[PDB]
């Protein structure tokens, strides 16, 4: 196992190197808009993002040590949370807006064009604001995103396998060490490090909540997204 032998800095290096690119939307500002079109845009984008996500997951230390079955399960559980944290991350420097893509910057008013999306938009904006207020670092972000991947489906899965749960828990602990390492380097005191770590992990609960609510609205589509959504039913 290479994940376990990774130093904190190597963990960070590996995670940063594995970052997916920021994709462009098909947004045409000359065109009006509509529930149909906006959802076409977001669906088309997410679908392309999923392809990059799947290949990013393969580069998350420890992920490839899992059975194909487990890898599938984790991605089926965590895909929308991962799209969401990515969205809120790139939206940090755009107060009041969600940067779905460099060419698609939306505000809550436009989120009304889809029934029931506005409430979720507000949660996403709140999360982005929280990240901005906390001054979340790219190094911290990549750790959080990886934690979501490994954690969200770990309790949703042969006895022997249980060693599969356990390997995941060890990798999770490694990422925690990594987060703490980053904060200590940033000059935070011990009390500050534990407080920040907690603040960041509590945000994950809100990201789970948003994903759950969105999933509910989604399964109420591309072939891959269809297969992914069906996973939540």
């Amino acid at each position: 196992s290479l994940a376990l032998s990774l130093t904190a800095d190597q963990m960070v290096s590996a995670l940063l190197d594995a970052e997916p690119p920021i994709l462009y939307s098909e947004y045409d500002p000359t065109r009006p808009f509509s529930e149909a079109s906006m959802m076409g845009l977001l669906t088309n984008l997410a679908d392309r993002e999923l392809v990059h996500m799947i290949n990013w997951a393969k580069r998350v230390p420890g992920f490839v040590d899992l059975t194909l079955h487990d890898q599938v399960h984790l991605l089926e559980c965590a895909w929308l949370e991962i799209l969401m944290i990515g969205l809120v991350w790139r939206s940090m420097e755009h107060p009041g807006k969600l940067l779905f893509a460099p060419n698609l910057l939306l505000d809550r008013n436009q989120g009304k064009c889809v029934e029931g999306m506005v409430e979720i938009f507000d949660m996403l904006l709140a999360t982005s604001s929280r990240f901005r207020m906390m001054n979340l670092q790219g190094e911290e972000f990549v750790c959080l995103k990886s934690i979501i991947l490994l954690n969200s489906g770990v309790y949703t899965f042969t006895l022997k396998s249980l060693e599969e749960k356990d390997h995941i828990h060890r990798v999770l602990d490694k990422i925690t060490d990594t987060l703490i390492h980053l904060m200590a380097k940033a000059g935070l005191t011990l009390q500050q490090q534990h407080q920040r770590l907690a603040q960041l992990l509590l945000i994950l609960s809100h990201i789970r909540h948003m994903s759950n609510k969105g999933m509910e609205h989604l399964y109420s589509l591309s072939d891959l997204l269809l297969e992914m959504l069906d996973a939540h039913r």
Binding site: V51, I54, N55, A57, K58, L68, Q71, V72, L75, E76, D223, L224, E227, M228
Partner: peptide, 9 residues
């Protein structure tokens, strides 16, 4: 599963 496939490539 498409997801399974892509993971396998």
């Amino acid at each position: 599963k498409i997801l399974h496939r892509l993971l396998q490539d």
